Write a protein that binds this DNA or RNA. Sequence first.
RNA 1: CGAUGUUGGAUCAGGACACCCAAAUGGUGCAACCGCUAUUAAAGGUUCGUUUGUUCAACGAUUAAAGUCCUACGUGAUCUGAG
Lengths: 223, 153, 110, 307, 115
Amino acid sequence: RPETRFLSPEFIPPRGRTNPLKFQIERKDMLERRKILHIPEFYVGSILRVTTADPYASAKTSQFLGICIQRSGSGLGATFILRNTIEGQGVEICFELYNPRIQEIQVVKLEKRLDNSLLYLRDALPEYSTFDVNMKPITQEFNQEVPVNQLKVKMKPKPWSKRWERPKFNIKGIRFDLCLTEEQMREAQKWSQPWLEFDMMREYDTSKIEAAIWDEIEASKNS
Amino acid sequence: ISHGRVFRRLGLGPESRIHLLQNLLTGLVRHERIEASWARVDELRGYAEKLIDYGKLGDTNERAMRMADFWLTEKDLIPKLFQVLAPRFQGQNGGYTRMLQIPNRNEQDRAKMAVIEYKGNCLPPLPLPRRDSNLTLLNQLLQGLRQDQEASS
Amino acid sequence: AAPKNRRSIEVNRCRRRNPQKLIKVKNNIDVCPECGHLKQKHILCGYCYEKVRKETAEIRRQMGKQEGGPFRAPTTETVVLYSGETPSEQDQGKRIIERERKRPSWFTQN
Amino acid sequence: HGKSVTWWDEHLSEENVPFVKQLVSDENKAQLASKLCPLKDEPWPIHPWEPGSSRVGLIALKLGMMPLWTKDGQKHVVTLLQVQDCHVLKYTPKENHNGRMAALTVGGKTVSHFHKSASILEFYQELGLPPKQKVKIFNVTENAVIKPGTPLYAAHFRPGQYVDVTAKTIGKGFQGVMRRWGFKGQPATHGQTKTHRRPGAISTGDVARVWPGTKMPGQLGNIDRTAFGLKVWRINTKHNIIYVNGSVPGHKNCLVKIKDSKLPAYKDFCKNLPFPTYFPDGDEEALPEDLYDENVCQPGAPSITFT
Amino acid sequence: AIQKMTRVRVVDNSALGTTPYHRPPRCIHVYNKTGVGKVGDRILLAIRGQKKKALIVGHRMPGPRMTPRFDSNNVVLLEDNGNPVGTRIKTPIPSSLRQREGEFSKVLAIAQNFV
RNA sequence: CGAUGUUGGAUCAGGACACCCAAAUGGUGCAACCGCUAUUAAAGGUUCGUUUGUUCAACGAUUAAAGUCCUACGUGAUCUGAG
Ligand SMILES: [Mg+2]
Ligand SMILES: [Mg+2]
Ligand SMILES: [Mg+2]
Ligand SMILES: [Mg+2]
Ligand SMILES: [Mg+2]
Ligand SMILES: [Mg+2]
Ligand SMILES: [Mg+2]
Ligand SMILES: [Mg+2]
Ligand SMILES: [Mg+2]
Ligand SMILES: [Mg+2]
Ligand SMILES: [Mg+2]
Ligand SMILES: [Mg+2]
Ligand SMILES: [Mg+2]
Ligand SMILES: [Mg+2]
Ligand SMILES: [Mg+2]
Ligand SMILES: [Mg+2]
Ligand SMILES: [Mg+2]
Ligand SMILES: [Mg+2]
Ligand SMILES: [Mg+2]
Ligand SMILES: [Mg+2]
Ligand SMILES: [Zn+2]
């Protein structure tokens, strides 16, 4: 069974000219944090349950379950969004990974979906935003390589929170043949910026950095 | 406010800029030495350096091929990139390009001009600036210091 | 908005003979060790670069005669030669351009 | 005589350039590590702490920003200020400067020799430090004075404290009236011609001039401001990093001037602080890798549970 | 970010709340000094051609991290005394509301689900 | 009168104090809470809407308050043009 290293996306530093030291510091601290709280591997579309410390509840713990809509951040600040419908009310929460108020993160389902971010579940029929609050964790063999769920989605009628048809978004996850006219699809294509893919210089390189910080992580396990 | 903007605006817009650099690149890969507006040559130099690193990725890599497809316009050149340029850069990581300022254009628009080049080409060599020789008085005074950094160690 | 009065010649001399509108003297000029013409220190010598340009053009002309058309460019490296020269073992297997002129002093054999 | 322009590099051969670089960098290492031992050289007399006293400051380097949490659950954002090479340079006595307080001149991070001026290089030559990028002047009560040529470290500030950070703000260039002042514009659509941004009326009919204070388009942002009342949370002793509270004026990677807060409520806080300044030599005990405030959740910890 | 002239959704069971009308219930005036309402903010509401007061429960505008963000702009019909005019509230509500007991006591009493 | 382009808005406001708010006080047919008066004080403030071209005015909701005025009934070589 071949193992390709999975790197939690927040160890990847941003592209700016920020001094590389700052990131070393931040990483030491979040690796320190990882020793207490165990942060699992997961991707957008995977379903998580998060336990929080809440002062105002009866049991000081607060559970929330939902699909991961997006991950963004870097360093200590990195966040993820969980989406779930309750009683017909769509609800999202935005959790900071490294916040000490977080007790435990539990992956109920490890999954990829066709898009790096799906915010469009806001505009989809409510089923894709709904999950059983009590649903039990499901386990996998690694060699299945984080199975990519291929599911196109049904939409409410336009307008939508954003225009998902536009090329800047790159969404394969929506079912567009049911939603739109061929004319609206030619229309969306006037915003296409083909040259961007071939721009070379626009592309960000990592691999040297990733080698470095992976080295750093191993050096954090050893001690 | 221009803060941390790496690319300069050229041509009729962003796309026109890409096509400008397209032609310049094609020209560079064909003739191996060209001269143009100092700003445009400066802009190009990045792409001309990365193209060679897509050439190093080999004929068989698909990404490198449709990359060289888009950027090299006369399709005849795409082999030359892979089977001539990319091989003759092997040892060197980044050293592919030489860019020098030429005297301002003799036309009435009096532009700022640069020559840009792929190293190791077969052409009369540019009259590069030479450093001073070591026999020069000041350098000879430094050689003394050096030989006394050796003698005292 | 229209000027209320003619500007006097004294005022105008003040504006245009001002130090900031004067052509500023370039202190970076020097002589090219090769041909002894003039050049700025951060720029190639115009003259020498003209020699190189002419020769480059001739080479390109004659390597345009070896290519029967627009889109044929060699899949091999090329080497340029002059009167009384022969391709080395290291340089064979390459496209050869043969020029009439004797090999120029600045141009080395390599 | 038409004497031509010249720079440090110009006449050196390809041989001598690496040599000269080695020469300079090596003497920089020597010089910095020589003044590394302040207390054993000829320390100026250390005085005890008087009530109305004021300490020296630092010249730090804005790194970036980071989140940080407090045991009550609240989130904070902090600015990392790294002290790089910080030395006191000269000392102007009380009667020679303000007639009130003495002045210590502190240097910022090291720069290249070649791009400074004969005067300045002479000033450092007679000192024995390498040239500093930025140099600021600190007002200091005469019991606080140190000896020029002395290092200053991040430990000079203890966690929980308040500081003042001065720097050049981010230069936004020549700006319109809306960004520079915050005038509303005129409405966009309802038939306005070419006005949607302009300042409007700039004055009164009768006054017949425009007053001197009048807010108008112009340069914005490259200029010095000071942040006050900044709590310091955490100190990293290995890399010399101060974590201050909130935003500090200037662009990241710029040099900055820190001192204790001159705000009234914090006036006498100095008594518990390492004063003339901090001396890593004298105590002969190391400090922990990090010093924290007592409200700060640490990078490892119980992971707070309310009860 | 509820403000003047927003259309809101009355969550609780109510006479005014549930029964249809041709104009959706609108926000007239928010009782904050900023003209903008947030979670746990008083509001004046025009419903069915009369004014009633409301408490903002949840809203679509993002907020501090780990705060719930909702798919509709939710209110609780409310009288002058701070007495909820509804019997009970089905749809979920911010736990953050429990920070203020003094005002929201009687309203938090009739709440079912906390998120 | 060989032109000193005119109402209301917009923008930006400069000023007075004959003070609407904020501060300090005297008197009360001032117990307290409110108020009604008068003195001193002009650094800073003085809301959003429905109808009117409107300034006024009426009305809805508020505010610590929604001041009175002068500035070519401030301000069209900055805008508007409903009148
Ligand atoms: Mg929207
Ligand atoms: Mg142009
Ligand atoms: Mg700038
Ligand atoms: Mg506007
Ligand atoms: Mg018009
Ligand atoms: Mg017009
Ligand atoms: Mg317009
Ligand atoms: Mg006057
Ligand atoms: Mg009615
Ligand atoms: Mg007249
Ligand atoms: Mg006249
Ligand atoms: Mg005013
Ligand atoms: Mg008065
Ligand atoms: Mg009062
Ligand atoms: Mg006033
Ligand atoms: Mg009048
Ligand atoms: Mg007027
Ligand atoms: Mg007018
Ligand atoms: Mg006009
Ligand atoms: Mg005018
Ligand atoms: Zn020459």
